[PDB]
């Protein structure tokens, strides 16, 4: 429990000893400013709860200052590893916190600040980026396309893999990934087999099928995936050299070393300049193996086995 502000003491002790013999005129412009400073935090807290119906997120600095939050972290019943992690990433801690207004009675205004508990720490995590994989025909509507639908964040947890499909709810601080398990699916470790062999029988990899061949790009951690189809002009450009690669039809990748810009059609993408090593793993596109005549081309939420069964 924290007492962050004592307006009762400041109004009854300082101020309010004004001898109201019709005058009350005991004042100094200093204590007028000082009262404004003390009262402003209450006003800002009242403002925030008025526009958020008593529940706010992230917890603002008015709701909990940095010093108060750090002190709160220091006294929480958690490991020193968890205290160090929360202290070093206070801004993420604020983003993953709620402020719920409880009660105002007995000269006490009380609200609960609901802080995160990071029970899983320092386990390896990886991110999966997927792009559509169509056939390279120039004509429109004459293509069969396939796309892996399991993109997102994956992290090892209690002998399983916690999978976060909406990667926009995960915050990355350098090499650290902050994720909420309430937005996660628990999967067997064999889900990583979809990255070494999509046709493995130990896990049924998730894909979707389509006949719309449209060009796009996916910016990854250390590179860019380019899906070029039809007559779209896809190029990789450098800030000091200009266009240095023209992609052919199909799915290709380029690392961020030597490349600062990827253009797909009329869309220009800046690649991340993060330092790291990239590896191109050669292989035949799996869409080549499928006969278009018996190809199920509107499987929105499907799998490798399910598509094989329909064929």
């Amino acid at each position, epitope marked *: 429990t924290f007492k962050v502000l004592d307006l009762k003491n400041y109004i009854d002790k300082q101020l309010l000893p004004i001898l109201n013999k019709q005058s009350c005129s005991i004042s100094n412009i200093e204590t007028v400013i000082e009262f404004q400073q003390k009262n402003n935090r209450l006003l800002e807290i009242t403002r925030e709860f008025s526009v958020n119906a008593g529940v706010t997120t992230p917890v603002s600095t008015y709701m909990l200052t940095n010093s108060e939050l750090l002190s709160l972290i220091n*006294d929480m019943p958690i490991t020193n590893d968890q205290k160090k992690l929360m202290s070093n990433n206070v801004q993420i801690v604020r983003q993953q916190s709620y402020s719920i207004m409880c009660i105002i009675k007995e000269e006490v205004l009380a609200y609960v600040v609901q802080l995160p508990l990071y029970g899983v720490i320092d386990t390896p995590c990886w991110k999966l980026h997927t792009s559509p994989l169509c056939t390279t025909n120039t004509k429109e509507g004459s293509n069969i396309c396939l796309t892996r639908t399991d993109r997102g964040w994956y992290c090892d947890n209690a002998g399983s893999v916690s999978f976060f499909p909406q990667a926009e709810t995960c915050k990355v601080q350098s090499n650290r990934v902050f994720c909420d398990t309430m937005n996660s699916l628990t999967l067997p470790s064999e889900v990583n087999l979809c990255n070494v062999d999509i046709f493995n029988p130990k896990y049924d990899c998730k894909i979707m099928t389509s006949k719309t061949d449209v060009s796009s790009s996916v910016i990854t951690s250390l590179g860019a995936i380019v899906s070029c189809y039809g007559k779209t002009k896809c190029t990789a450009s450098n800030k000091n050299r200009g266009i240095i690669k023209t992609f052919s039809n199909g799915c290709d990748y380029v690392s961020n070393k030597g490349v600062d810009t990827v253009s797909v059609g009329n869309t220009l993408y800046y690649v991340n300049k993060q330092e790291g090593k990239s590896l191109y793993v050669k292989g035949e596109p799996i869409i080549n193996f499928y006969d278009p005549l018996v190809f199920p081309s509107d499987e929105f939420d499907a799998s490798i086995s399910q598509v094989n069964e329909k064929i």
Partner: antibody
Amino acid sequence: QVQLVESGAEAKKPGSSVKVSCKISGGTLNDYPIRWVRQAPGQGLEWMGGIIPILGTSYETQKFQGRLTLTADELTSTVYMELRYLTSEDAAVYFCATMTSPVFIDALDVWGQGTRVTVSS
Amino acid sequence: EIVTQSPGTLSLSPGERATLSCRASQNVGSNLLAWYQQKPGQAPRLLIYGASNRATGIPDRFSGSGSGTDFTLTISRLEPEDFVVYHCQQYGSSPRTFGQGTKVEIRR
């Protein structure tokens, strides 16, 4: 290690004001609100009041409101108490105390050496 | 709020078990009862907080028990250094009130 060092012994004539100091070592004033307690010789302890510098606030018990003033000085890491309108029943040993954890609430962990105050005649 | 201690003076031989009582006028909120040991002419030392939890570094010969109105401090076997005064404080309500104190003296 947090510790408190108090001022020397004082002897004062009745009706005057006495001001006792308490300097904290090993900890910040904002991290350690200071409670002022006293005991007359032979008698038990008596809770006088307390100061919370981090809130810039102070309080005294009903028996000491209007006579006891608690103040803090952060740059010298010191807390001062001042008692006025002295009486024969105000000669006692005065202690400043604190606590090392929030679980104690008001179980006082660290104490000052004490300061003897003699209401003279 | 009143918290009175019993007895005024305790006479026990060294190595015997000491039992000190602290009663209250009304129920102490959350069993917020503390026991301090004070040597002659120095600051009190905190022994028990929460009426049962002993502080850091305090030998396990000191223990606390009780609830509501009545609380007890027990010394399993008295050391020569244990014959000092002992105070009980309540901090479950405002103002915080101490006890009169109990003296433990060597019987001979």
